[PDB]
Amino acid sequence: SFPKYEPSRLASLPTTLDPAEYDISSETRKAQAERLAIRSRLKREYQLQYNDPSRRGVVEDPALIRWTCARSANVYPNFRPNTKTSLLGALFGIGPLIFWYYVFKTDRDRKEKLIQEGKLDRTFNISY
Amino acid sequence: SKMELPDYKQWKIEGTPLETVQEKLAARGLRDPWGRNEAWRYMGGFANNVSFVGALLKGFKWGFAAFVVAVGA
C-alpha cells in the first residue's frame, strides 16, 4: 500500500523496514553478539580508565588520534596517479579557472571598447 | 505535606462524549475502554465551555448598556 520507500544518498532507510531483519541468519545473530562483545570490552576499559580518582587528565582516545592522523598525515602516502584522479584534478583545477578567465576578458573587452568610443557614464565617475 | 488528592469512586463517568463512544464501541462489539481518566478533563468547572461564536459574543454582553449611556450623554 505504498511505493515501498526507495533509498538514496539522502533517503536514510529507517530501522523498521530493513527488510533484512526478517530472514535473519543465525550467523548474523552471532555477528550481532560479537558486536555486543566489542562494545562491551571497549566500554569496560573506558570505565576502567575513566572513573579513576587517582587519574587527573584526559581520556587519551587512540581512535580519534588514529582518525586525525589518517585524515591529515596519511594522505600523500598512499597515492598513485590514476585516470580518475588526473581527470578530476584537471576538472577542478583548470576548468572553472579558465571559465572565469574567459568571462573576465570578455566583460573587460566590452568595457574597453565602450570607453574607447567614449559613450560611458563618465559624466561623473570619480571614485575609480 | 498534604495534597489530599480527591479520590476515586467520585466520577462514575456518566458523561456525554464518553457515554456515546462507549455505546458506539459496545454496538461495535469491543466493550473495553481505558476507564474514567477523562472525567476530570471533561466535567467539574468544565462541561459546556463556550463555542467559537460565543467567544465573540462575550464582547457585547456588558458593553451595550455603557454604549447607550454614552449615546445618551
Partner: protein, 87 residues
C-alpha cells in the same frame, strides 16, 4: 517554576492512577506487586499503563526500558530518578 514533589505523595498519585484503571480490582492493588503474575493483565495492557503515565507525567520512558518495570515500586523509583525528589 518550582513544583514541589514528595516520594509518598507521588507514590499515592501513581497508586491512585493505577486504581483508576478498569480491569484490576481497586481492593487488591499493592504498592509491591507484580504485573504479569497476579494482577491479570498482559504485556499489552502493561504498556498501556506505561503510556498513560508517560502522558500524565510529561516525559516518556523508552521501550529499551519498558521491558523491565514489572512492579509499581520500581516505577516510583524510576520517576523519582527522573525528578530527583528531595528538598
Amino acid at each position: 517554576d518550582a513544583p514541589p514533589l514528595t516520594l509518598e505523595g507521588i507514590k499515592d498519585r501513581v497508586l491512585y492512577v493505577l486504581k483508576l484503571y478498569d480491569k484490576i480490582d481497586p481492593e487488591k492493588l499493592s504498592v509491591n506487586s507484580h504485573f504479569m503474575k497476579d494482577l491479570g493483565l498482559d504485556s499489552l495492557d502493561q504498556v498501556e499503563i506505561i503510556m498513560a503515565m508517560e502522558d500524565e507525567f510529561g516525559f516518556e520512558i523508552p521501550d529499551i526500558d519498558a521491558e523491565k518495570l514489572m512492579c509499581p515500586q520500581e516505577i516510583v523509583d524510576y520517576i523519582a530518578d527522573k525528578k530527583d525528589v528531595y528538598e
